[PDB]
């Protein structure tokens, strides 16, 4: 599903401030990462990235194309293609703790300034 910035912001609250990344920064990162499409699937040099957070099967989740993946998140990549964001968020937190925000290539170039526009005022 193609979510809105506010739908996304409300769903990822538990991630706010984790590893020092705010909700504004995440709204910005997710728009440029998947266009807020929970079913996004992108290939990238022999590997596939899934969902809202574009979590890769290279190390993070297990896919049928690449079954011996480290599957660090301990989850099937298909669980990242639905609208229940709790496990997508749990896996993102593992990426943040282990690898850091730079796993998301959109962060530095697109989310280093003009963060206010990303605020959701809708309760």
């Amino acid at each position: 599903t193609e979510l809105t910035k506010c739908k996304v912001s409300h769903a990822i609250k538990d991630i706010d401030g984790y590893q020092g990344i705010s909700l504004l920064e995440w709204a910005c990162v997710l728009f440029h990462t998947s266009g807020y499409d929970t079913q996004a699937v992108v290939n990238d040099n022999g590997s596939t990235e899934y969902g809202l957070f574009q979590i890769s099967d290279r190390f993070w989740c297990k896919s049928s194309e690449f079954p011996e993946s480290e599957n660090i998140c301990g989850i099937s990549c298909d669980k990242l293609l639905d609208d229940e964001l709790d496990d997508d968020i749990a896996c993102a937190k593992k990426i943040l703790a282990i690898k850091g925000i730079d796993y998301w290539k959109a962060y530095k170039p697109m989310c280093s300034e003009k963060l206010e526009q990303w605020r959701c005022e809708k309760p």
Binding site: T4, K105, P109, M110, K114
Partner: protein, 272 residues
């Protein structure tokens, strides 16, 4: 004849834009008898200071082109522009290169007429309000500011994709657009970066008059997300000097003059 008024008296404002009824160019031509071979139109009632080349990057989207022509020709005539329509068709099977095709359109259009303004438009975007003028302004103009795709709003303030317009001087000033972006994404952000580096700001109409419809379509396997896009946009300040109008090379395979437009099929090479 004297100068066309600042605002056209022919505008109707909001329009219904639907992609239901199939189009027939023969009919479009029938309805637009004033459009000359190659899709050129010049007002007869007044003199327009806007000599506009409208550049459409393109690859296998004829059904989209039909709708684009069906809606834009009447709009552009109402806007009282001295314009020409150019469809830059990418031959080959390499990933789609939107920016490079726009650069080719700039160079090729200039061979036909002394255009002073260039509108760069995706072939699937139709403006829903004719007060959203397809011409150039004192600063770079972003036109498709409220696309239905983004809920009829601007997705981010730095967004310069979709439909935009640059005067010839503005375009020249940034060394045109990058040629090195292959595949989907980031080339428009690179363009945005260029304008900013040259000290320009982005002019836009408000979100109401900027309402724009996007014809729907399935993913283009020939235009998948560019893996290098995020890195590339971080180096625009330096690369805009060596990648642009000044390094543009390509081969023209065919120039086709149809009654509603000029289609130029080109071979723009492969990822370097």
């Amino acid at each position: 004849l004297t100068a066309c008024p600042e605002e056209s008296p022919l505008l109707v404002g909001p329009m219904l834009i639907e992609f239901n009824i199939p189009v027939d160019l023969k009919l479009v031509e029938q309805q637009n008898p004033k459009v000359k071979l190659g899709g050129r139109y010049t007002p007869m009632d007044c003199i327009s200071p806007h000599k506009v080349a409208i550049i459409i990057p393109f690859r296998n989207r004829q059904e989209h082109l039909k709708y684009w022509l069906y809606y834009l020709h009447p709009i552009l005539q109402r806007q009282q522009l001295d314009y020409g329509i150019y469809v830059i068709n990418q031959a080959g099977e390499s990933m789609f290169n939107r920016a490079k095709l726009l650069n080719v359109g700039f160079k090729e259009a200039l061979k036909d007429y002394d255009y002073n303004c260039f509108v760069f438009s995706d072939v699937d975007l139709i403006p829903m309000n004719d007060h959203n003028t397809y011409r150039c302004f004192s600063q770079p103009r972003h036109i498709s500011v409220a696309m239905d795709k983004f809920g009829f709003s601007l997705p981010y303030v730095q967004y310069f994709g979709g439909v935009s317009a640059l005067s010839k001087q503005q375009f020249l000033s940034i060394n045109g657009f990058p040629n090195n972006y292959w595949g989907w994404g980031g080339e428009d952000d690179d363009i945005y970066n260029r304008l900013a580096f040259r000290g320009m700001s982005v002019s836009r109409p408000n979100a109401v008059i900027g309402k724009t419809r996007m014809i729907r379509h399935s993913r283009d396997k020939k235009n998948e997300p560019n893996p290098q896009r995020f890195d590339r946009i971080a180096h625009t300040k330096e690369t805009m000097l060596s990648d642009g109008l000044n390094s543009l090379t390509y081969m023209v395979l065919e120039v086709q003059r149809y009654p509603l437009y000029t289609k130029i099929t080109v071979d723009i090479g492969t990822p370097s």
